[PDB]
Amino acid sequence: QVQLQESGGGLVQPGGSLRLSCSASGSSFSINTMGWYRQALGKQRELVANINSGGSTNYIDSVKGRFTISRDNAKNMVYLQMNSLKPEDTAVYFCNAARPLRPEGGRWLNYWGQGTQVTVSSAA
Amino acid sequence: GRPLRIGDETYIPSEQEILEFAREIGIDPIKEPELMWLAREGIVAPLPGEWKPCQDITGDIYYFNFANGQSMWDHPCDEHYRSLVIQERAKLS
């Protein structure tokens, strides 16, 4: 059973930096496509960044060049480095694990963490 | 969306993944352990023809047939395994 636990969220000043972490359980970690998604209040969940087993990454255009996704396969960890944070980055951030059952042409299963709040605010 | 690809043994489903797939195809595992082999077989079934696994921008996984543009949430073979579960249940009764 793949299970995800995010941490590192909270209040952050606009223009600041923040690193989110997620611990993943299960044996399939290194083959999974790991990702970060975010849901602004009242809105849909949206890709932030992801990274497949081979290390290919995709970023949503609004965070490209400010954010970086990385994985530590030995520790079963995913990370999101955030820079130049803006008010529109305020959202609940979820870690995602897309798990393949075949290297090609297979079923994939979709797992989610519970999310961590990031609030980009000058009250931080 | 974007096709799901691994890029450049671990693929064996967990007992928990098999339990969940068994429920999805209509098996009550606690009561019907004799049906679970259909879940073990069906969960690793290949996508037919030109079907590929994809993930949309909200993170939801779906299946897309690049040859004809058909799309669906479930694996295209899951309906076949639902039917086999019903037949196997009746056969064993």
mmCIF file of N, CA and C in Angstrom, chain B residues 12-48:
data_model
loop_
_atom_site.group_PDB
_atom_site.id
_atom_site.type_symbol
_atom_site.label_atom_id
_atom_site.label_comp_id
_atom_site.label_asym_id
_atom_site.label_seq_id
_atom_site.Cartn_x
_atom_site.Cartn_y
_atom_site.Cartn_z
ATOM 1 N N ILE B 12 4.941 -6.097 -9.419
ATOM 2 C CA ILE B 12 3.980 -7.016 -8.801
ATOM 3 C C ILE B 12 3.020 -6.216 -7.925
ATOM 4 N N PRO B 13 1.712 -6.314 -8.137
ATOM 5 C CA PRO B 13 0.777 -5.568 -7.287
ATOM 6 C C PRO B 13 0.815 -6.062 -5.851
ATOM 7 N N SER B 14 0.524 -5.152 -4.927
ATOM 8 C CA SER B 14 0.472 -5.545 -3.531
ATOM 9 C C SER B 14 -0.806 -6.333 -3.259
ATOM 10 N N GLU B 15 -0.809 -7.052 -2.133
ATOM 11 C CA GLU B 15 -2.033 -7.723 -1.703
ATOM 12 C C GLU B 15 -3.170 -6.728 -1.539
ATOM 13 N N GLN B 16 -2.842 -5.499 -1.133
ATOM 14 C CA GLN B 16 -3.856 -4.473 -0.935
ATOM 15 C C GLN B 16 -4.398 -3.968 -2.265
ATOM 16 N N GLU B 17 -3.533 -3.842 -3.272
ATOM 17 C CA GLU B 17 -4.003 -3.439 -4.590
ATOM 18 C C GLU B 17 -4.895 -4.510 -5.201
ATOM 19 N N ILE B 18 -4.569 -5.781 -4.968
ATOM 20 C CA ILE B 18 -5.419 -6.850 -5.474
ATOM 21 C C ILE B 18 -6.781 -6.835 -4.782
ATOM 22 N N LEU B 19 -6.812 -6.587 -3.463
ATOM 23 C CA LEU B 19 -8.081 -6.485 -2.731
ATOM 24 C C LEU B 19 -8.975 -5.414 -3.333
ATOM 25 N N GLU B 20 -8.402 -4.245 -3.599
ATOM 26 C CA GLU B 20 -9.193 -3.142 -4.130
ATOM 27 C C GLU B 20 -9.684 -3.450 -5.536
ATOM 28 N N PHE B 21 -8.818 -4.005 -6.393
ATOM 29 C CA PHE B 21 -9.284 -4.355 -7.729
ATOM 30 C C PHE B 21 -10.372 -5.423 -7.665
ATOM 31 N N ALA B 22 -10.228 -6.389 -6.746
ATOM 32 C CA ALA B 22 -11.260 -7.410 -6.562
ATOM 33 C C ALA B 22 -12.616 -6.781 -6.257
ATOM 34 N N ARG B 23 -12.645 -5.798 -5.350
ATOM 35 C CA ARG B 23 -13.905 -5.122 -5.059
ATOM 36 C C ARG B 23 -14.449 -4.421 -6.297
ATOM 37 N N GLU B 24 -13.568 -3.805 -7.087
ATOM 38 C CA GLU B 24 -14.004 -3.051 -8.258
ATOM 39 C C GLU B 24 -14.663 -3.948 -9.295
ATOM 40 N N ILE B 25 -14.265 -5.220 -9.371
ATOM 41 C CA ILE B 25 -14.881 -6.146 -10.312
ATOM 42 C C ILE B 25 -15.944 -7.016 -9.644
ATOM 43 N N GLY B 26 -16.382 -6.653 -8.440
ATOM 44 C CA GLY B 26 -17.562 -7.252 -7.854
ATOM 45 C C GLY B 26 -17.336 -8.382 -6.877
ATOM 46 N N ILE B 27 -16.105 -8.666 -6.511
ATOM 47 C CA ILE B 27 -15.803 -9.722 -5.553
ATOM 48 C C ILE B 27 -15.905 -9.173 -4.138
ATOM 49 N N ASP B 28 -16.520 -9.953 -3.256
ATOM 50 C CA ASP B 28 -16.468 -9.724 -1.818
ATOM 51 C C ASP B 28 -15.361 -10.613 -1.263
ATOM 52 N N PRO B 29 -14.140 -10.094 -1.104
ATOM 53 C CA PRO B 29 -12.992 -10.997 -0.882
ATOM 54 C C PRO B 29 -13.089 -11.839 0.375
ATOM 55 N N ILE B 30 -13.581 -11.271 1.479
ATOM 56 C CA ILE B 30 -13.673 -12.020 2.732
ATOM 57 C C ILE B 30 -14.568 -13.240 2.560
ATOM 58 N N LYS B 31 -15.647 -13.099 1.792
ATOM 59 C CA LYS B 31 -16.588 -14.189 1.580
ATOM 60 C C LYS B 31 -16.231 -15.067 0.389
ATOM 61 N N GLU B 32 -15.504 -14.543 -0.594
ATOM 62 C CA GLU B 32 -15.274 -15.249 -1.856
ATOM 63 C C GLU B 32 -13.787 -15.331 -2.192
ATOM 64 N N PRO B 33 -12.971 -15.936 -1.319
ATOM 65 C CA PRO B 33 -11.547 -16.069 -1.657
ATOM 66 C C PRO B 33 -11.329 -16.889 -2.912
ATOM 67 N N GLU B 34 -12.272 -17.775 -3.235
ATOM 68 C CA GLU B 34 -12.180 -18.605 -4.429
ATOM 69 C C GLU B 34 -12.278 -17.808 -5.729
ATOM 70 N N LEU B 35 -12.695 -16.536 -5.685
ATOM 71 C CA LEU B 35 -12.752 -15.711 -6.888
ATOM 72 C C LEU B 35 -11.521 -14.837 -7.072
ATOM 73 N N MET B 36 -10.640 -14.767 -6.074
ATOM 74 C CA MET B 36 -9.615 -13.732 -6.072
ATOM 75 C C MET B 36 -8.602 -13.919 -7.195
ATOM 76 N N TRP B 37 -8.457 -15.141 -7.719
ATOM 77 C CA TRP B 37 -7.514 -15.331 -8.818
ATOM 78 C C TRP B 37 -7.896 -14.518 -10.049
ATOM 79 N N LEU B 38 -9.189 -14.223 -10.224
ATOM 80 C CA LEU B 38 -9.601 -13.368 -11.329
ATOM 81 C C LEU B 38 -9.101 -11.947 -11.124
ATOM 82 N N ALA B 39 -9.069 -11.493 -9.867
ATOM 83 C CA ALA B 39 -8.519 -10.176 -9.559
ATOM 84 C C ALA B 39 -7.013 -10.137 -9.792
ATOM 85 N N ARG B 40 -6.304 -11.193 -9.374
ATOM 86 C CA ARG B 40 -4.860 -11.245 -9.585
ATOM 87 C C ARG B 40 -4.525 -11.239 -11.070
ATOM 88 N N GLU B 41 -5.325 -11.941 -11.871
ATOM 89 C CA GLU B 41 -5.113 -11.985 -13.314
ATOM 90 C C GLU B 41 -5.501 -10.666 -13.972
ATOM 91 N N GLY B 42 -6.686 -10.149 -13.645
ATOM 92 C CA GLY B 42 -7.174 -8.967 -14.333
ATOM 93 C C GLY B 42 -6.394 -7.698 -14.036
ATOM 94 N N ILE B 43 -5.812 -7.586 -12.840
ATOM 95 C CA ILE B 43 -5.192 -6.310 -12.480
ATOM 96 C C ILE B 43 -3.959 -6.050 -13.334
ATOM 97 N N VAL B 44 -3.289 -7.104 -13.805
ATOM 98 C CA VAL B 44 -2.080 -6.942 -14.609
ATOM 99 C C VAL B 44 -2.355 -7.088 -16.102
ATOM 100 N N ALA B 45 -3.620 -7.177 -16.501
ATOM 101 C CA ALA B 45 -3.945 -7.344 -17.910
ATOM 102 C C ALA B 45 -3.385 -6.185 -18.738
ATOM 103 N N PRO B 46 -2.916 -6.447 -19.956
ATOM 104 C CA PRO B 46 -2.420 -5.362 -20.804
ATOM 105 C C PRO B 46 -3.568 -4.540 -21.363
ATOM 106 N N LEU B 47 -3.270 -3.282 -21.643
ATOM 107 C CA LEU B 47 -4.216 -2.456 -22.372
ATOM 108 C C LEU B 47 -4.343 -2.995 -23.791
ATOM 109 N N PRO B 48 -5.557 -3.164 -24.310
ATOM 110 C CA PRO B 48 -5.703 -3.648 -25.685
ATOM 111 C C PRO B 48 -5.138 -2.637 -26.671
#
